[PDB]
Design a binder for this molecule. Structure first.
Ligand code: C7B
Lengths: 224, 421, 357, 279, 318
């Protein structure tokens, strides 16, 4: 099995993504259908429990061949989710999560992850300053502005390596990442970092117990 | 409308120590040809009809040299206006003098007098005019850059620049120099100023061929503190806007320091600045015509190559030169009327006019200016300079960084002989 | 089942029997993401091949052997079956997927043939795990010797041929030729190398960068100007992609042209190759068997006017960039292999000796 | 020393004897006399003999012999040398029958009524012509005078005793007489891998003219002359063998066939023999 | 007066800096018009002084750009015309000038007919279902081929010229007329040569030896044609004929900025590597099968007689 897909169901102003709002099919039904459409006979889903166990009971009613819905603690997040499900995964991870209403032919992002043997591949569509190279495939710089106490950070070394960087501001991530096994090794070995979405930025693609394996390249796909 | 230009013939930033003290920087022969001659050739080739040569320091010498040049002949299609003043000491002063006297009228080429380039800016000029016509003449300047690599020698760390531009309108949003900086910052509201894609560029070599509207001069007189071009750009981008044109297939660079001088000389000898090549004799001279042989060996007339003397590659030999036998010249420019001894090894050494070298001399990556002299058994380490009729005695080996001249406060040597102090 | 790749563009009539593919339109967009029909490593390698990330012959063969190691390592014998036949039967779809992503090279063909021969030679009575890692160790030994020891031997044999102060002309990118020149410069030889390159791949920049990093004096020019520089050249060194039974050299498209012009200029032509790239196959032209790259690569970015932009919109316009060409054995002087120096006449003899005969 | 004078007197012993045969005889007696019973020390004395003998004589044939038969004996510890001397004796016997085999395979390739064209004096060419005339074959002969050492006159004198019309020609007149020669037979002094021959200075001219007129270019040589060299141009040949050079190289492109004791061979087959022998 | 001087200058600098006009037929027309205006707008009475000033200005022209030989050889044509007129009137001053002017006029009216002459001649050299190969771009050769295409069906293989891929626009122009055209890299010349019937190429200059100075890479194509014994045809008008010989001259190849061969963005290696970009190259006459001109086909072994017919032998040095 190349990929062991996982779908997180914990949110992370408008809409609790886990349970309530369903136009036509349950919120996780779209991720589950996207997964089952392209192989993925086995799926691991992480079930909320701060709802007082009101999520897993109703998500086994979608007529899917077989899925794994692991229970959670009284309250945890998404990096907590990955650390919780670490012992039961043994290969590369394809992390999605509940709020995913998308058209994506994920063959593209998975091919980006494969061809260049990336440490990580991501999916985005048009306050997070994201800078890519001329090809637009490899992730050079990425940083929110809530994080950014100082004005803006960019190293001279990365500009010497990659001269021109194309930047974007109005990019929103689909939370669709393809994680290596050793990145999950790093995550488990360092409980410091929570909120995976914020864990993408300490990529340290450039050379500084931190490299559990060489290069740790990262990549992006920008949708139509 | 016609096309004017401003040619600042005095690099006010005091750099060439003490080479500028003897003759102005713009008169330094790059490869037997002055830099101002290269700039005038570029200006008349790109289509400039009237230029304004502002000379401040050693103005008499510059005027005398230019008056005899081709560009001052009555048949020349490029008109020159040598302007004379000991008052202005900065580019901003030049531009405010321009707007005070009201010389330029429209889209004049601002350029210094020490630029080596062959860029045809008709495309950039029409782009600038289209931008100003469409957007209410709010674009005041178009900065012309060349696609480069951060590793290229012609991109010195002193003049290295990093910009943040708009990939759609190519307008310059942020601009700064990376001299001695391991950290670059780009303000936040750059993204607020242009909302359709910001791109940071570090591969851009600054050609210093900015083509500007008279509004640039109006602004330079509206802000007395504006002294040079970089300050003007910084002050305008923090507040009218500036635009850009990037060149891929044409050469351009200004000789700021000695490193840039060497790099641009090596590029010119190797025909990177075609058609501005030594063989072409772009200046209508008689002592500056050479025959381009294989491996870029511009063997001139009556050079008198010795028996077994070897010219490896990218070697220029001025006319009237005399080269001993069993010599080894490689990637070096030899000025006209130079005598070279026997078993002399020259490597990337720009021997100017009248240089006399005795037998056994080993000169590497040096610069012997006019009428320099070295005696028998003299070794020069890289980045060593001799200046204006200075003599180095026998059995001397100069260190790496060693400038020798007849000016005590401006050299490691003085009026005495170079043999010993 | 793996679908067939659509043949992009309009093929030249003489090459209608060969496939023409587009780099943009890949083959993995109709496959399951957790690939099951094709092993993950094999689809990975096919995608790497199609995009052109793996170019060199030695590089392609080594990547193939590593992917095959990853495959056999993860292979498990089904019940009531023997590994000998089952594994060689299961490897065929992977080879077909590869050849669909990009035609197999001679090194790849020879490696796959040797691997199948070894698999069929695995004992029926033997268990599974030690058979698997015996196959892994055999692949390790095979690649180790046939690549690195062959390279070292050929480097020594070529060093005892390069003299001091001689100009050597090289063409395109070749790991073997670059290693030979680097080792010759390190040993003490003082020479200069002229690098010849050709559109559209411009693979000569690779060996140019390698030589400049090694400190060897280098010069660069494209293949049309080769006639101008050969008077200075003292010797032509090339890297073969395949050596056929008749002694002909099947290598990059610009090799035979350079050999012809060098013969016209009295410049001896040397080709460096290993024994594992020898092939009992034979051809007399670049038409019977070749590879057609993406014709869209011919388009030149000459500033503002790309002339071949919409070449498909012109009915009578055909584009073609050949990846290989054959040099007749009489245009080549030396072939430097593990066995030493041989004439191209002696290639099939070496083939026989390497056939355990 | 001991080998120098014995080689000299072997040359004096048999003026009708080759130099490679004398070299193998001298090395055989050298190994049989000193009684070197050492696994690795024996090779030192061997290569000393070889270097001495090609220092006195600048022949590629002597060095090639040396190399091939030193490998042959080394390819054969007390019983090692005891069987090695056997194999050396049989090697000498085969090398003796070499020239007779060469004559009696190649004498049938001379169509009678033809015109042989030969370079400087060579024993193998003389033997094959003797075999041909013994088979009742009449033909005309042109011989190059071999200007450096007038061996063409010697060849003409030796062949006149065989009752055949011999016309020694000028060194530079082969280009004039090439149209009057039905074939060219030259005895190679050494055979390189690719099939070329490192023979006297004018042999390359012979071959080039042959290709200029499509005339068959035949070469006769013993297999102890097979040297493992690969010269690309004239200067690529070892300079020691050249000493105004004395011996130059001829590409296999210019040679039709080789007549060795191993049978008639295409210039392609000598490399096969050499790589089977493994130097 | 000064109009003539400034026009001569303008022309000199246009020839020196870049290529103007682009077509060398237009260059011949321009230089002939300028020579006419010179011979009209000077105070010359004896033919010797006129020839001397013409030689001086032609020396200046040749020094402007040596690789552009059309200007120089047409200056030599004008000198031969002056010599012929002087011999006619001496073997007479106003008649001399007007006769020289009408001679230049007939030269000019026959100048624009060379294109059409070669186009008409093209038909009897192309048969149905033939495979042509050509390299680079040549207006004469594309006119040749598109005139032969009106009555014949054939294939053209255009080898692009690196770095200046002028062959691409030639292939497009040929495809416009429905001439089945294959475009390839120059690296594939020998690989495809085995399937080519003829080679038709233009030229920049024909030397007295019969050799021709053509775009780089054409010498390799000629070597391939000789190897495969395919006829190599050169469709060159009679104003590209240069009386100079191959190695009695100077400045044969034209070297342009290496930026065309290796770009500036390669970085530090550009200080260690020597890049060379020769535009033209030398093709010996042994590799040419037939020359096609405005008068008709001729073997390379008759170009010397054409020289004797065009240029005075004392004017080969200008
Ligand atoms: O289709 C093409 C295109 O050729 C190329 C297109 C591109 C490239 Cl890369 C190379 C070649 N060429 C034709 C040219 C006629 C031929 N032969 C015939 O049609 C028949 O030939 C004969 C028939 C009878 C005689 Cl007597 C001689 C030849 C077939 C192929």
């Amino acid at each position: 099995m190349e990929f062991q897909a996982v779908v997180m169901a914990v949110g992370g102003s408008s809409i609790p993504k886990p349970l309530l709002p369903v136009g036509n099919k349950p919120l996780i039904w779209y991720p589950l259908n996207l997964l089952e459409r392209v192989g993925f006979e086995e799926v691991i889903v992480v079930t909320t429990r701060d709802v007082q166990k009101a999520l897993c009971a109703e998500f086994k009613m979608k007529m899917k061949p077989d899925i794994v819905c692991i229970p959670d603690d009284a309250d945890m997040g998404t990096a907590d989710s990955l650390r919780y499900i670490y012992p039961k995964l043994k290969t590369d991870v394809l992390v999605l999560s509940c709020d995913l209403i998308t058209d994506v032919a994920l063959h593209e992002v998975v091919d980006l992850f494969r061809a260049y043997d990336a440490s990580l591949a991501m999916l985005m569509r048009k306050r997070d300053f994201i800078g890519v190279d001329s090809t637009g495939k490899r992730l050079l710089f990425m940083a929110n502005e809530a994080d950014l106490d100082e004005e803006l950070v960019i190293k001279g070394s990365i500009l010497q390596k990659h001269p021109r960087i194309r930047f974007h501001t109005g990019l929103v991530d689909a939370h669709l990442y393809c994680l290596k096994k050793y990145i999950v090794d790093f995550l488990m070995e360092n409980g410091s970092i929570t909120s995976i979405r914020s864990e993408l930025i300490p990529y340290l693609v450039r050379k500084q117990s931190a490299s559990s394996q060489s290069q740790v390249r990262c990549y992006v796909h920008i949708m139509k | 409308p016609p096309l004017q230009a401003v040619l600042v013939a005095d690099s006010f930033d005091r750099r060439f120590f003490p080479i500028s003290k003897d003759q102005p920087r713009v008169l330094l022969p790059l490869a037997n040809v002055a830099l101002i001659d290269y700039t005038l050739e570029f200006l008349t080739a790109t289509g400039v009809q009237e230029t304004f040569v502002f000379c401040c320091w050693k103005a008499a010498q510059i005027k005398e040299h230019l008056l005899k040049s081709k560009w001052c002949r009555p048949t020349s299609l490029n008109v020159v206006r040598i302007i004379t003043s000991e008052l202005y000491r900065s580019l901003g002063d030049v531009l405010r003098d321009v707007d005070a006297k009201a010389l330029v009228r429209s889209d004049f080429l601002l350029v210094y007098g020490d630029v080596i380039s062959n860029i045809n800016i008709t495309r950039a000029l029409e782009e600038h005019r289209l931008r100003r016509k469409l957007e209410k003449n709010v674009s005041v300047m178009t900065m012309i850059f060349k696609e480069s690599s951060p590793s290229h020698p012609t991109r010195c760390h002193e003049d290295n620049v990093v910009v943040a531009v708009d990939s759609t309108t190519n307008r310059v949003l942020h601009f700064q120099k990376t001299q001695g900086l391991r950290r670059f910052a780009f303000p936040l509201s750059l993204f607020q100023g242009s909302s359709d894609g910001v791109e940071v560029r570090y591969d851009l070599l600054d050609c210093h061929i900015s083509i500007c509207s008279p509004q640039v001069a109006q602004l330079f007189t509206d802000n007395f503190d504006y002294q040079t071009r970089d300050d003007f750009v910084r002050g305008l981008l923090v507040n009218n806007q500036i635009h850009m044109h990037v060149t891929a297939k044409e050469y351009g660079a200004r000789v700021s320091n000695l490193h840039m001088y060497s790099a641009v000389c090596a590029d010119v000898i190797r025909r990177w600045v075609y058609p501005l090549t030594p063989e072409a004799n772009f200046t209508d001279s008689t002592t500056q015509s050479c025959t381009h042989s294989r491996h870029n060996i511009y063997r001139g007339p009556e050079v008198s190559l010795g028996h077994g003397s070897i010219l490896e590659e990218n070697v220029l030999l001025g006319s009237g030169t005399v080269i001993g036998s069993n010599c080894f010249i490689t990637n070096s420019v030899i000025g006209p009327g130079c005598h070279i001894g026997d078993n002399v090894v020259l490597d990337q050494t720009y021997l100017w006019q009248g240089v006399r070298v005795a037998a056994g001399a080993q000169i590497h990556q040096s610069l012997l200016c006019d009428n320099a002299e070295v005696k028998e058994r003299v070794t020069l380490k890289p980045r060593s300079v001799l200046t204006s009729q200075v003599v180095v005695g026998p059995n001397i080996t100069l260190p790496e960084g060693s400038v020798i001249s007849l000016h005590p406060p401006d050299a490691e040597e003085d009026e005495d002989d170079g043999e010993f102090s | 089942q793996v679908p067939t790749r659509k043949d992009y563009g309009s093929k030249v009539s003489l090459f209608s029997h060969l496939p023409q593919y587009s780099r943009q339109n890949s083959l993995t967009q109709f496959m399951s993401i957790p690939s099951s029909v094709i092993h993950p490593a094999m689809v990975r390698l096919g995608l790497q091949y199609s995009q052109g990330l793996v170019s060199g012959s030695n590089a392609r063969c080594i990547a193939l052997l590593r992917a095959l190691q990853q495959v056999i390592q993860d292979y498990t014998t089904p019940p009531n079956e023997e590994l000998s036949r089952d594994l060689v039967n299961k490897l065929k779809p992977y080879m077909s997927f590869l050849t669909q992503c990009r035609p197999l090279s001679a090194s790849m063909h020879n490696a796959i043939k040797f691997l199948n021969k070894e698999i069929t030679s695995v004992g029926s009575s033997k268990r599974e795990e030690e058979a698997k890692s015996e196959l892994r160790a055999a692949i390790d030994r095979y690649v180790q010797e046939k690549i690195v020891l062959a390279a070292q031997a050929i480097s020594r044999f070529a060093y005892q041929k390069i003299s001091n102060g001689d100009v050597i002309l090289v063409y395109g990118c070749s790991s073997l030729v670059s290693r030979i020149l680097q080792e010759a410069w390190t040993e003490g030889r003082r020479f200069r190398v002229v690098v010849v390159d050709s559109r559209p791949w411009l693979e000569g920049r690779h060996t140019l960068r390698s030589l400049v990093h090694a400190g060897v004096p280098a010069s660069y020019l494209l293949i049309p100007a080769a006639s101008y520089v050969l008077p200075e050249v003292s010797k032509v060194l090339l890297g073969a992609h395949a050596l056929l039974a008749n002694g002909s050299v099947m290598s990059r498209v610009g090799t035979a042209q350079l050999a012809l012009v060098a013969r016209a200029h009295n410049v001896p032509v040397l080709v460096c190759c290993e024994t594992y790239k020898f092939c009992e196959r034979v051809q007399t032209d670049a038409f019977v068997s070749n590879e057609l790259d993406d014709p869209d690569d011919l388009q030149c970015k000459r500033g503002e006017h790309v002339a071949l932009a919409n070449w498909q919109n012109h009915a009578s316009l055909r584009l073609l960039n050949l990846v290989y060409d054959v040099t007749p054995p009489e245009l080549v002087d030396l072939v430097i292999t593990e066995l030493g120096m041989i004439p191209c006449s002696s290639v099939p003899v070496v083939l026989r000796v390497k056939s355990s005969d | 020393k001991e080998l120098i004078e014995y080689f000299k007197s072997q040359m004096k012993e048999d003026p009708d004897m080759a130099s490679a045969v004398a070299a193998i005889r001298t090395l055989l007696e050298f190994l049989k006399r000193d009684k070197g019973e050492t696994i690795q020390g024996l090779r030192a004395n061997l290569t000393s003999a070889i270097e001495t003998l090609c220092g006195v004589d600048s022949s590629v044939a002597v060095s090639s012999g040396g190399e091939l038969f030193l490998r042959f004996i080394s390819l054969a510890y007390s019983k090692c040398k005891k069987i090695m001397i056997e194999r050396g004796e049989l090697f000498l016997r085969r090398i003796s029958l070499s020239r007779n085999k060469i004559a009696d395979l190649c004498h049938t390739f001379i169509k009678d009524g033809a015109t042989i064209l030969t370079h400087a004096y060579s024993r193998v060419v003389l033997r094959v012509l003797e075999a041909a005339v013994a088979a009742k074959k009449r033909f005309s002969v042109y011989v190059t005078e071999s200007q450096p050492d007038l061996s063409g006159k010697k060849m003409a004198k030796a062949l006149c005793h065989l009752n055949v019309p011999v016309t020694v020609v000028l060194d530079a007149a082969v280009g004039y007489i090439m149209e009057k020669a039905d074939l060219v037979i030259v005895g190679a002094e050494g055979v390189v891998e690719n099939g070329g021959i490192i023979n006297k200075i004018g042999t390359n001219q012979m071959a080039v003219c042959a290709k200029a007129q499509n005339k068959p270019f035949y070469v006769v040589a013993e297999s102890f002359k097979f040297v493992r060299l690969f010269p690309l141009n004239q200067q690529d040949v070892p300079d020691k063998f050249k000493y105004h050079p004395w011996v130059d190289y001829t590409a296999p492109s210019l040679i039709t066939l080789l007549f060795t004791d191993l049978g008639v061979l295409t210039p392609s087959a000598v490399s096969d023999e050499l790589i089977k022998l493994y130097l | 007066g000064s109009e003539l001087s400034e026009r001569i200058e303008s022309f000199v600098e246009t020839l020196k800096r870049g290529g103007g006009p682009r077509s060398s037929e237009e260059m011949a027309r321009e230089t002939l018009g300028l020579l006419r205006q010179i011979i009209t707008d000077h105070r010359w009475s004896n033919a010797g002084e006129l020839m001397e000033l013409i030689r001086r200005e032609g020396r200046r022209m040749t020094a402007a750009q040596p690789s552009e030989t059309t200007v120089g050889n047409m200056v030599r044509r004008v000198l031969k015309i002056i010599r012929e007129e002087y011999g006619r009137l001496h073997g007479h001053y106003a008649q001399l000038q007007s006769n020289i002017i009408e001679a230049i006029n007939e030269l000019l009216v026959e100048l624009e007919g060379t294109m059409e002459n070669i186009a008409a001649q093209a038909l009897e050299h192309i048969h149905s279902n033939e495979v042509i190969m050509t390299i680079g771009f040549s207006r004469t050769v594309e006119a040749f081929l598109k005139e032969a295409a009106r009555k014949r069906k054939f294939h053209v293989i255009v080898a692009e010229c690196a770095p200046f891929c002028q062959g691409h626009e030639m292939a497009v122009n040929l495809s416009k007329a429905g001439i089945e055209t294959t475009v390839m890299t120059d690296a594939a010349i020998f690989a495809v040569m085995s399937r080519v019937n003829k080679v038709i190429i233009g030229t920049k200059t024909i030397l007295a030896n019969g050799a021709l100075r053509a775009v780089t890479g054409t010498h390799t194509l000629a070597l391939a044609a000789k190897h495969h014994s395919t006829p190599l045809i050169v469709c060159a008008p009679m104003f590209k004929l240069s009386p100079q010989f191959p190695n009695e001259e100077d400045s044969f190849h034209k070297f342009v900025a290496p930026e065309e061969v290796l770009p500036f963005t390669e970085g530090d290696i550009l200080e260690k590597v020597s890049v060379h970009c020769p535009v033209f190259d030398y093709v010996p006459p042994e590799l040419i099968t037939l020359f096609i001109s405005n008068i008709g086909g001729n073997a390379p072994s008759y170009i010397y007689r054409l020289m004797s017919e065009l240029y005075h032998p004392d004017d080969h040095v200008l």
